[PDB]
Amino acid sequence: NWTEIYPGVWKATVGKPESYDLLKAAGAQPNKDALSKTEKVSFPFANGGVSLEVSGGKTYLRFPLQKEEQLYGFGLNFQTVHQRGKILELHVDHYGGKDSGRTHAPTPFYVSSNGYGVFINSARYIKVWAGTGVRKDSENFPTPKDRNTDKTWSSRPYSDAVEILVPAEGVEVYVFGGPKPIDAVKRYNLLNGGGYLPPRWGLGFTQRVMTRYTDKDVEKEVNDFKEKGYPLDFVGLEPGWQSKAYPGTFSWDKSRYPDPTSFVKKMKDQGIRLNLWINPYISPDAPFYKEIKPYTGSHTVWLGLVPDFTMAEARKPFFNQLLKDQIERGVSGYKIDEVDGYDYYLWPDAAKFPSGLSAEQMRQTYGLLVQRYSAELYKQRNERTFGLVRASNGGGTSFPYVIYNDYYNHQDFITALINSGFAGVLWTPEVRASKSGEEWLRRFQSNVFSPMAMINAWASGTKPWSYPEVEADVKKFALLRMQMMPYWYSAFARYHFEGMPPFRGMGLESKEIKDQYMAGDDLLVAPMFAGEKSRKVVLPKGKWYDFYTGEYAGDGEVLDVTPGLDKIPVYVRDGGIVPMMPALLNSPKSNQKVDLEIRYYGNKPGEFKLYDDDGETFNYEKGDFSWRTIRVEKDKSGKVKGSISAAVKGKVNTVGKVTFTAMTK
Amino acid sequence: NWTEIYPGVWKATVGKPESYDLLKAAGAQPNKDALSKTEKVSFPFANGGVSLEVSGGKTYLRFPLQKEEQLYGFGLNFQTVHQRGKILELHVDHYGGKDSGRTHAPTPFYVSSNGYGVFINSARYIKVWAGTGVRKDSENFPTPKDRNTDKTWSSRPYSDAVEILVPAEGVEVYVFGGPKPIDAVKRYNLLNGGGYLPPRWGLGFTQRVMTRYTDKDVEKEVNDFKEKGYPLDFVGLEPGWQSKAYPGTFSWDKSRYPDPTSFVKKMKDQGIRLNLWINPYISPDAPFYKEIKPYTGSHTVWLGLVPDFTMAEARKPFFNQLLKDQIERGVSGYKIDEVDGYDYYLWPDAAKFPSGLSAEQMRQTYGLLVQRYSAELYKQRNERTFGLVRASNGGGTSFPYVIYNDYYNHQDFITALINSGFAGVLWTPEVRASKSGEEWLRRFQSNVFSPMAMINAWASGTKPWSYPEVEADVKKFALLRMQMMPYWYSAFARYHFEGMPPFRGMGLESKEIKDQYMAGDDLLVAPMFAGEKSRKVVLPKGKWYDFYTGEYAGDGEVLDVTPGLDKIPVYVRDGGIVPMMPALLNSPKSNQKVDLEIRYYGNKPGEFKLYDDDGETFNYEKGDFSWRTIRVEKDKSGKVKGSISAAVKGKVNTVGKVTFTAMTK
Ligand SMILES: OC[C@H]1O[C@@H](O)[C@H](O)[C@@H](O)[C@H]1O
Ligand SMILES: OC[C@H]1O[C@@H](O)[C@H](O)[C@@H](O)[C@H]1O
């Protein structure tokens, strides 16, 4: 039976579900308030064809499909966006070069073009046949043909269902109503708690430095950023901050970091936060080793113990060490590495954990656990965090982490960014190295139109200016990222409050689009790749305007575009609005007013909801935030006319002078 | 507890095993007689380290490894021979281009270089970590190192066990003693019933013809073989013999085969047997469709019903039709196609079968079932068969079928032939098409040193002579195949009686050898590949002689060989013997005496056991067979001296005049 638990959200419990699952692993709390405000809509499967069965130790699910229905999701795929006709086993792993279901966030959630979604709340590995099976008792069984004589004989005849096998005696399933595909995604995300509300400093630029950097090396890099006029909010430290790595001590190396408290404070006094690399695997020389040992798995990763983070006895020593030795010195956050795979690095499924949780369910949720309990340390102190994680899953929407990996195909990086929007996670196509200045700038351009603007120089030692043929353009895109901070922050506020993914695929207001994405509500981004002079851009219905010049670009048509090296193709919807702050080098503080230039595109009257609060604490949870409504139009003479709603009494107000600019002459 | 059930064979039952498994699926009967004659040997795991555990619904197995122990097996792999350090999920499938465990015969049997083997008797998909897991409580846990400072830090530290996960509440495990790796393989094979004893006609040449051939077309091809002087024993008919294919009617097409009884008889009267392509998927127009329908799975393959061959009610209509419409007309055997995969063609694991058998266990054993019940039809009539099958598994050693596939990488074809010897199945690297005459001859050369000498022209329409630059050499290798018939037949007799795989890897009397194999007891085959002028050949200790000239080649060393296009590198052990019959075009009948030239290589006194019987019935089961012992030496003057043991009273005797030839001048 399907219990309508929120508007457009239904829940069925099939058989006897396991006591551990994805939502429970994450400790994911629904945002009831936001959910209650969504439209009531009808059950998406109104005409039967749904079958939920327990048998032979497993749970068999079947959901119907109509002809010309297309599917999206099944997690963080890198080479496919359309999922109908695919066969997958959803299984946490480092991405392996093919979309098989093995990936960093193999979210068991899919979305239909008909405007609904389905989430399977199991922490097991899950098999999916997304319209490949052909059933003899199907209402749509194609007529059998003779391959010997009939030219129309087809190797892939019509399949009318999504079939899913969960290896357990039952499962919780959730179905999400529409009417549009994005509505289903938003409800799914809100069931997960909505997206995290990042700190403003998390949307600034981050530089990760080489593994071997000393505190002195870091101080110098910071000084070079300032001297050269490049923005920077947080520096990423790689494994050499620890006295041992692989496996880890979780303590500052005495030689590379003699005085941690002093170093963390100096960087902070200069506006620079720190984010620390960890993997969660415990060295014998870690100060809590003996205490944690009984609460660790049978198998090690890089010879380090694997904590069973489902046990308080493992959590307390691990997270206490992070709290006391780093967070309390001022460390802003973490990069939770290598909680994904490969199978030959992580523990095998044959491993045993002291809680009794299967190693399979541990593999599926390890990332979720480390995100969960690390984030909680920051929430307890009324401070936001923002960091990186190499694995996540269903249940992880609300965590303050962005996914990254060691793969590097640029096209595929963009495709993953698209799919991140169907998967309830954030993904950054990071910049590390490049053969050429061209590739370096192309990668930097797409990166600044993503959740996290980052160069990860852990091995490369690169900086934004390392490629001199393109350094001036790289600088421009770095400063653009800062200038766009109010646009991104408002987008992330929609992620938190309404569950709206800030980066997502097209047609989420015919053929597969793998290389364009929406970035916030107003911008269509169409990246260039190295070696290309031009590309096609498919524009949805409605008028679009050039992001740079403001000129009319097109409407419901395909463009051939030759942008030059200095531009990433970006197009703004009619009436679209991008609030721009000044090109600050550091994110603004909560007590700081910032002027805004409201760049308004096209001729349709536009409306933007600018989010404002202190940008660093959880005070917004008590209602200390505002949405400032901005409206812009051209008057009868063609001159820009704009308004902003008034600041609200008693609320934080960081909006300075506001000027309006009609970008379309 | 380990019950020693035969000499060098032990059985443990862990937990509660499933009532269906591989041995039961195959109906595999042990050859007690042959097994009782093997040496008693000690239990291979004498020092502990074995763990058999049931937990969380699954069976966890761990077997210890010593340092420098190497592993072989885990089924029919195409790119790897050494299996230590590999991670696999054993899963029946068409080979996918990588050794992941997905393959045609994913036999859950492995062999150690220390001289033992292990077989996991489950029809589930099975996970294997062959010395990749590193356990914290291991006796051999490497010392944790610091990757920040230590150059010796290793990403793959020492693992001391094979770990296997079976998804069931228990399992039967079998362990096989040594002392040598081949001894373990032989016992495994004998537990399965030994290899099938093929008919002599099955070791002749087979031509499969284009799908669209009519009976007239086949008659003509047969006449061309005879006219051109090429050998032929059986012709393969492809899907057009059926009135419908994909899915199938299992009845002769009225238009292409008007008079089946007459056609089958004409071909037979000319010495030519027929082997018929089937897949087991049922057309609505098949004459037994209505009867079988309730005993078929929920899902179809190419819109054909999938019989549950575990039910007598499915077996009877299916196999009765084959019996009455084909076997009783004289059809010699079948090619059981497309019982492997891919996942998007075969039924999904979510399918349901009317017997209640999981679709997983069905996938794992479907090939075994169709081999089993088809072979039985022939045994009931006291006639041997020999054919082809695209899937098999543990339990399938005794079946009269050779595996083939639609992959075509030549190197990998040879590697699969090597691995076939560790996997309890036969594999043929078939010939279909080639870009060049060179490739065509190279492929033909390796093929005639394999279980089945075959061109499969189902799509290509090729014949042995299709490439005129190499046609004379192709002919020579075809006639060689016939001349070598007594050598091959004796090798296959060892397969049946002693479990000795007729094709196998090296070191089965340091580094991985993927491109050489032993063919019978005496011949080391080292194939050339197209584009190569020369290759290395690693010779084991002991003297070796050139197969063609008889000259000394080497001893415990590596050769660089430039054979020419007209030769496949083959080397004969010291004292090795190849009995040669004449270059007949058709296999000899049971009532026929055949002269033999005994080609003796080197100088060590040699001994060969020539197997002899009627070559077509199961009378050998009643004791109507003989082993004729042949001994050859050079006398003090350097002249060949040979003997053959006397024919046995009352037994079939096909040996004619016997002459001896010392190949090494
Ligand atoms: O060794 C440090 C590196 O470790 C990798 O696992 C990670 O993906 C890299 O981004 C970097 O952190
Ligand atoms: O359609 C006929 C063909 O079918 C394939 O599945 C098979 O591998 C080929 O060898 C040939 O039999």
Side-chain angles (χ1 to χ4, degrees):
Chain A
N1 277 339
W2 296 100
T3 303
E4 172 173 337
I5 49 170
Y6 297 105
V9 185
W10 295 262
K11 181 192 195 192
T13 293
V14 191
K16 191 157 192 187
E18 298 190 80
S19 59
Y20 186 88
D21 60 49
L22 299 175
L23 297 184
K24 282 179 187 65
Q29 286 311 301
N31 183 333
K32 305 165 187 295
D33 211 295
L35 274 164
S36 68
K37 284 175 191 140
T38 64
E39 180 178 343
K40 276 200 172 202
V41 287
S42 304
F43 193 65
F45 305 116
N47 303 321
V50 179
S51 176
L52 314 172
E53 270 191 281
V54 174
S55 202
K58 315 211 190 234
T59 304
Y60 295 60
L61 310 177
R62 185 168 74 252
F63 308 88
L65 290 173
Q66 307 312 303
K67 300 169 236 300
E68 297 176 4
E69 197 168 342
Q70 187 52 86
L71 309 177
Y72 316 92
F74 299 119
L76 193 73
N77 296 118
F78 279 76
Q79 297 183 334
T80 58
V81 172
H82 289 179
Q83 297 304 147
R84 188 167 181 171
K86 305 296 178 176
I87 299 172
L88 307 166
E89 192 187 36
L90 302 175
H91 186 314
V92 169
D93 208 355
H94 196 282
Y95 188 65
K98 283 221 293 269
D99 290 346
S100 66
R102 273 171 175 277
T103 183
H104 306 269
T107 309
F109 172 66
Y110 75 95
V111 164
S112 175
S113 56
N114 283 176
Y116 64 85
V118 179
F119 174 53
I120 313 301
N121 182 26
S122 174
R124 295 291 174 165
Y125 307 143
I126 291 153
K127 294 174 165 175
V128 176
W129 298 265
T132 61
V134 176
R135 292 169 306 106
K136 71 172 167 182
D137 291 340
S138 169
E139 304 173 11
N140 305 288
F141 185 74
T143 306
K145 298 181 179 185
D146 179 26
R147 191 180 175 188
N148 292 153
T149 49
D150 194 345
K151 292 144 183 152
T152 62
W153 184 93
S154 157
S155 61
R156 297 286 288 270
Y158 184 77
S159 168
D160 65 353
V162 166
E163 295 170 287
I164 295 182
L165 195 60
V166 177
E169 303 274 14
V171 79
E172 303 186 345
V173 185
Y174 297 83
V175 170
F176 298 89
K180 300 263 272 162
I182 199 66
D183 297 315
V185 171
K186 287 156 73 180
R187 289 197 181 87
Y188 168 79
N189 281 337
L190 289 180
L191 185 70
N192 283 249
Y196 197 86
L197 184 70
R200 285 190 180 100
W201 61 257
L203 305 169
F205 184 78
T206 178
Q207 179 67 58
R208 311 204 68 84
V209 295
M210 288 184 75
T211 292
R212 74 179 182 71
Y213 266 37
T214 67
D215 61 359
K216 253 56 199 159
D217 292 316
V218 170
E219 289 180 38
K220 183 194 175 275
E221 272 254 327
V222 161
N223 284 315
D224 293 328
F225 268 78
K226 176 171 184 188
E227 166 84 12
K228 297 195 198 265
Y230 281 79
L232 186 66
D233 262 276
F234 58 113
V235 169
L237 301 182
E238 285 290 317
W241 78 263
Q242 289 169 250
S243 55
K244 295 201 162 86
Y246 295 84
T249 54
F250 305 88
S251 314
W252 297 86
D253 185 77
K254 306 270 193 185
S255 170
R256 293 180 298 266
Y257 294 84
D259 193 348
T261 292
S262 169
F263 165 64
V264 173
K265 199 167 163 300
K266 283 178 207 211
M267 291 295 92
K268 201 106 167 51
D269 297 345
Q270 266 188 105
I272 306 302
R273 292 174 159 83
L274 291 166
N275 174 287
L276 272 36
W277 180 97
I278 52 173
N279 67 43
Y281 310 123
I282 315 309
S283 175
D285 296 313
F288 59 87
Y289 176 75
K290 297 284 162 196
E291 180 184 353
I292 203 172
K293 185 154 174 169
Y295 306 100
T296 63
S298 67
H299 286 69
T300 58
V301 180
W302 315 118
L303 306 182
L305 304 185
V306 179
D308 187 331
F309 288 119
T310 73
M311 305 181 76
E313 300 90 344
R315 294 196 301 269
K316 207 187 175 170
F318 187 86
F319 294 107
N320 174 259
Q321 172 68 14
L322 299 189
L323 186 56
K324 302 294 177 213
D325 186 68
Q326 300 119 48
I327 302 193
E328 285 182 356
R329 296 186 147 100
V331 169
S332 71
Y334 290 86
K335 168 172 171 183
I336 302 161
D337 191 39
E338 201 128 58
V339 290
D340 49 353
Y342 304 103
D343 283 352
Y344 42 84
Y345 294 153
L346 264 66
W347 62 90
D349 296 330
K352 294 299 214 68
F353 288 91
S355 66
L357 189 71
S358 72
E360 174 185 4
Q361 291 161 115
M362 196 68 74
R363 183 71 174 281
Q364 290 295 84
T365 59
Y366 213 60
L368 289 175
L369 292 169
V370 187
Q371 290 172 79
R372 181 195 170 159
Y373 292 110
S374 67
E376 185 184 60
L377 296 176
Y378 283 98
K379 184 165 199 194
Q380 287 165 356
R381 296 167 51 89
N382 199 215
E383 332 182 277
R384 300 183 205 178
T385 191
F386 207 55
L388 292 158
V389 71
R390 227 173 69 180
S392 195
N393 214 326
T397 307
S398 69
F399 297 142
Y401 291 101
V402 182
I403 303 177
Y404 67 94
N405 75 8
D406 290 342
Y407 188 66
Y408 209 50
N409 185 96
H410 197 183
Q411 292 83 352
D412 289 4
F413 266 25
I414 300 305
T415 301
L417 180 60
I418 290 157
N419 286 144
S420 77
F422 298 123
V425 305
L426 295 169
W427 159 262
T428 185
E430 68 175 20
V431 188
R432 295 199 286 280
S434 286
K435 170 153 93 83
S436 60
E438 172 172 357
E439 180 191 352
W440 179 253
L441 178 60
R442 292 317 194 186
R443 285 179 184 274
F444 198 84
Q445 290 171 338
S446 62
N447 180 252
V448 300
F449 289 82
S450 99
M452 189 181 291
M454 173 166 56
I455 293 169
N456 175 14
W458 75 270
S460 79
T462 53
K463 307 97 169 63
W465 54 87
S466 291
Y467 295 74
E469 64 259 74
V470 296
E471 70 183 298
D473 294 316
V474 177
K475 203 185 185 170
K476 282 172 175 171
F477 282 92
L479 295 184
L480 178 62
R481 174 61 172 202
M482 301 306 296
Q483 288 202 284
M484 293 186 64
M485 179 165 290
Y487 182 88
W488 299 127
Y489 195 50
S490 303
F492 277 85
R494 300 204 60 212
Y495 193 29
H496 171 73
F497 286 101
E498 311 176 59
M500 178 72 164
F503 303 87
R504 63 210 177 256
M506 300 294 95
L508 267 54
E509 273 89 334
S510 211
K511 261 204 312 308
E512 190 180 55
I513 300 170
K514 279 159 47 255
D515 62 0
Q516 312 179 183
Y517 59 95
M518 297 304 293
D521 300 321
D522 303 274
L523 304 179
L524 181 164
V525 183
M528 293 299 283
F529 302 109
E532 301 177 330
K533 276 201 149 69
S534 62
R535 65 163 287 160
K536 301 181 195 288
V537 174
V538 184
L539 300 179
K541 309 250 180 165
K543 294 182 158 69
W544 297 83
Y545 299 81
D546 188 87
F547 179 72
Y548 304 93
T549 61
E551 305 174 351
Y552 177 71
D555 180 346
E557 67 189 278
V558 183
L559 306 178
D560 282 45
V561 179
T562 296
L565 194 49
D566 64 327
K567 294 178 179 172
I568 174 161
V570 182
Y571 299 92
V572 187
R573 70 185 175 166
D574 198 1
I577 280 152
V578 180
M580 304 279 260
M581 72 172 196
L584 302 180
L585 296 187
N586 200 235
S587 61
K589 309 251 139 50
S590 40
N591 58 15
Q592 215 183 301
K593 291 241 200 275
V594 168
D595 296 355
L596 291 184
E597 182 195 354
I598 303 307
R599 297 194 167 168
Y600 159 74
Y601 293 80
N603 298 294
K604 185 209 277 279
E607 181 176 324
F608 188 91
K609 300 281 178 88
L610 173 72
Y611 178 77
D612 191 17
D613 70 3
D614 73 8
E616 46 183 295
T617 74
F618 291 83
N619 292 351
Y620 69 94
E621 286 188 325
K622 312 284 175 42
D624 196 353
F625 61 90
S626 322
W627 292 97
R628 302 291 291 282
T629 295
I630 295 172
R631 287 193 176 87
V632 196
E633 210 179 316
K634 280 155 161 185
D635 78 7
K636 209 74 184 163
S637 174
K639 295 236 187 76
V640 72
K641 181 198 177 182
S643 62
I644 193 173
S645 77
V648 178
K649 184 185 281 159
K651 306 301 189 199
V652 164
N653 179 18
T654 70
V655 179
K657 297 176 192 127
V658 175
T659 54
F660 301 91
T661 299
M663 292 290 295
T664 303
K665 295 183 186 208
Chain B
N1 277 339
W2 296 100
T3 303
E4 172 173 337
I5 49 170
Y6 297 105
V9 185
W10 295 262
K11 181 192 195 192
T13 293
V14 191
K16 191 157 192 187
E18 298 190 80
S19 59
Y20 186 88
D21 60 49
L22 299 175
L23 297 184
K24 282 179 187 65
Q29 286 311 301
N31 183 333
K32 305 165 187 295
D33 211 295
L35 274 164
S36 68
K37 284 175 191 140
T38 64
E39 180 178 343
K40 276 200 172 202
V41 287
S42 304
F43 193 65
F45 305 116
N47 303 321
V50 179
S51 176
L52 314 172
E53 270 191 281
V54 174
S55 202
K58 315 211 190 234
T59 304
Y60 295 60
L61 310 177
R62 185 168 74 252
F63 308 88
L65 290 173
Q66 307 312 303
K67 300 169 236 300
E68 297 176 4
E69 197 168 342
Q70 187 52 86
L71 309 177
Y72 316 92
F74 299 119
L76 193 73
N77 296 118
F78 279 76
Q79 297 183 334
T80 58
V81 172
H82 289 179
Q83 297 304 147
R84 188 167 181 171
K86 305 296 178 176
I87 299 172
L88 307 166
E89 192 187 36
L90 302 175
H91 186 314
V92 169
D93 208 355
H94 196 282
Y95 188 65
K98 283 221 293 269
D99 290 346
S100 66
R102 273 171 175 277
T103 183
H104 306 269
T107 309
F109 172 66
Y110 75 95
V111 164
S112 175
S113 56
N114 283 176
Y116 64 85
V118 179
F119 174 53
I120 313 301
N121 182 26
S122 174
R124 295 291 174 165
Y125 307 143
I126 291 153
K127 294 174 165 175
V128 176
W129 298 265
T132 61
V134 176
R135 292 169 306 106
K136 71 172 167 182
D137 291 340
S138 169
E139 304 173 11
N140 305 288
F141 185 74
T143 306
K145 298 181 179 185
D146 179 26
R147 191 180 175 188
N148 292 153
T149 49
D150 194 345
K151 292 144 183 152
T152 62
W153 184 93
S154 157
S155 61
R156 297 286 288 270
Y158 184 77
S159 168
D160 65 353
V162 166
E163 295 170 287
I164 295 182
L165 195 60
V166 177
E169 303 274 14
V171 79
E172 303 186 345
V173 185
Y174 297 83
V175 170
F176 298 89
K180 300 263 272 162
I182 199 66
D183 297 315
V185 171
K186 287 156 73 180
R187 289 197 181 87
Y188 168 79
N189 281 337
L190 289 180
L191 185 70
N192 283 249
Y196 197 86
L197 184 70
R200 285 190 180 100
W201 61 257
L203 305 169
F205 184 78
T206 178
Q207 179 67 58
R208 311 204 68 84
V209 295
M210 288 184 75
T211 292
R212 74 179 182 71
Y213 266 37
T214 67
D215 61 359
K216 253 56 199 159
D217 292 316
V218 170
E219 289 180 38
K220 183 194 175 275
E221 272 254 327
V222 161
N223 284 315
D224 293 328
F225 268 78
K226 176 171 184 188
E227 166 84 12
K228 297 195 198 265
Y230 281 79
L232 186 66
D233 262 276
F234 58 113
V235 169
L237 301 182
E238 285 290 317
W241 78 263
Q242 289 169 250
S243 55
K244 295 201 162 86
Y246 295 84
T249 54
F250 305 88
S251 314
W252 297 86
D253 185 77
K254 306 270 193 185
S255 170
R256 293 180 298 266
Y257 294 84
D259 193 348
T261 292
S262 169
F263 165 64
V264 173
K265 199 167 163 300
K266 283 178 207 211
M267 291 295 92
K268 201 106 167 51
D269 297 345
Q270 266 188 105
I272 306 302
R273 292 174 159 83
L274 291 166
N275 174 287
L276 272 36
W277 180 97
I278 52 173
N279 67 43
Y281 310 123
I282 315 309
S283 175
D285 296 313
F288 59 87
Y289 176 75
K290 297 284 162 196
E291 180 184 353
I292 203 172
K293 185 154 174 169
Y295 306 100
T296 63
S298 67
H299 286 69
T300 58
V301 180
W302 315 118
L303 306 182
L305 304 185
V306 179
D308 187 331
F309 288 119
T310 73
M311 305 181 76
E313 300 90 344
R315 294 196 301 269
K316 207 187 175 170
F318 187 86
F319 294 107
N320 174 259
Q321 172 68 14
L322 299 189
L323 186 56
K324 302 294 177 213
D325 186 68
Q326 300 119 48
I327 302 193
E328 285 182 356
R329 296 186 147 100
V331 169
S332 71
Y334 290 86
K335 168 172 171 183
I336 302 161
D337 191 39
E338 201 128 58
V339 290
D340 49 353
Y342 304 103
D343 283 352
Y344 42 84
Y345 294 153
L346 264 66
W347 62 90
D349 296 330
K352 294 299 214 68
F353 288 91
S355 66
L357 189 71
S358 72
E360 174 185 4
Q361 291 161 115
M362 196 68 74
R363 183 71 174 281
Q364 290 295 84
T365 59
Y366 213 60
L368 289 175
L369 292 169
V370 187
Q371 290 172 79
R372 181 195 170 159
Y373 292 110
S374 67
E376 185 184 60
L377 296 176
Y378 283 98
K379 184 165 199 194
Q380 287 165 356
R381 296 167 51 89
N382 199 215
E383 332 182 277
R384 300 183 205 178
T385 191
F386 207 55
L388 292 158
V389 71
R390 227 173 69 180
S392 195
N393 214 326
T397 307
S398 69
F399 297 142
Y401 291 101
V402 182
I403 303 177
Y404 67 94
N405 75 8
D406 290 342
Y407 188 66
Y408 209 50
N409 185 96
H410 197 183
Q411 292 83 352
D412 289 4
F413 266 25
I414 300 305
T415 301
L417 180 60
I418 290 157
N419 286 144
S420 77
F422 298 123
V425 305
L426 295 169
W427 159 262
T428 185
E430 68 175 20
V431 188
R432 295 199 286 280
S434 286
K435 170 153 93 83
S436 60
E438 172 172 357
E439 180 191 352
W440 179 253
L441 178 60
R442 292 317 194 186
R443 285 179 184 274
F444 198 84
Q445 290 171 338
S446 62
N447 180 252
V448 300
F449 289 82
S450 99
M452 189 181 291
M454 173 166 56
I455 293 169
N456 175 14
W458 75 270
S460 79
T462 53
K463 307 97 169 63
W465 54 87
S466 291
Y467 295 74
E469 64 259 74
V470 296
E471 70 183 298
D473 294 316
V474 177
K475 203 185 185 170
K476 282 172 175 171
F477 282 92
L479 295 184
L480 178 62
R481 174 61 172 202
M482 301 306 296
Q483 288 202 284
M484 293 186 64
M485 179 165 290
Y487 182 88
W488 299 127
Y489 195 50
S490 303
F492 277 85
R494 300 204 60 212
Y495 193 29
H496 171 73
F497 286 101
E498 311 176 59
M500 178 72 164
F503 303 87
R504 63 210 177 256
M506 300 294 95
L508 267 54
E509 273 89 334
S510 211
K511 261 204 312 308
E512 190 180 55
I513 300 170
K514 279 159 47 255
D515 62 0
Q516 312 179 183
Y517 59 95
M518 297 304 293
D521 300 321
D522 303 274
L523 304 179
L524 181 164
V525 183
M528 293 299 283
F529 302 109
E532 301 177 330
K533 276 201 149 69
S534 62
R535 65 163 287 160
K536 301 181 195 288
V537 174
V538 184
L539 300 179
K541 309 250 180 165
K543 294 182 158 69
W544 297 83
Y545 299 81
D546 188 87
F547 179 72
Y548 304 93
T549 61
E551 305 174 351
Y552 177 71
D555 180 346
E557 67 189 278
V558 183
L559 306 178
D560 282 45
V561 179
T562 296
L565 194 49
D566 64 327
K567 294 178 179 172
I568 174 161
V570 182
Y571 299 92
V572 187
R573 70 185 175 166
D574 198 1
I577 280 152
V578 180
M580 304 279 260
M581 72 172 196
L584 302 180
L585 296 187
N586 200 235
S587 61
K589 309 251 139 50
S590 40
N591 58 15
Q592 215 183 301
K593 291 241 200 275
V594 168
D595 296 355
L596 291 184
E597 182 195 354
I598 303 307
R599 297 194 167 168
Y600 159 74
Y601 293 80
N603 298 294
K604 185 209 277 279
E607 181 176 324
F608 188 91
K609 300 281 178 88
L610 173 72
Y611 178 77
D612 191 17
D613 70 3
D614 73 8
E616 46 183 295
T617 74
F618 291 83
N619 292 351
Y620 69 94
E621 286 188 325
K622 312 284 175 42
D624 196 353
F625 61 90
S626 322
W627 292 97
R628 302 291 291 282
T629 295
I630 295 172
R631 287 193 176 87
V632 196
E633 210 179 316
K634 280 155 161 185
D635 78 7
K636 209 74 184 163
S637 174
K639 295 236 187 76
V640 72
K641 181 198 177 182
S643 62
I644 193 173
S645 77
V648 178
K649 184 185 281 159
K651 306 301 189 199
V652 164
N653 179 18
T654 70
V655 179
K657 297 176 192 127
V658 175
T659 54
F660 301 91
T661 299
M663 292 290 295
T664 303
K665 295 183 186 208

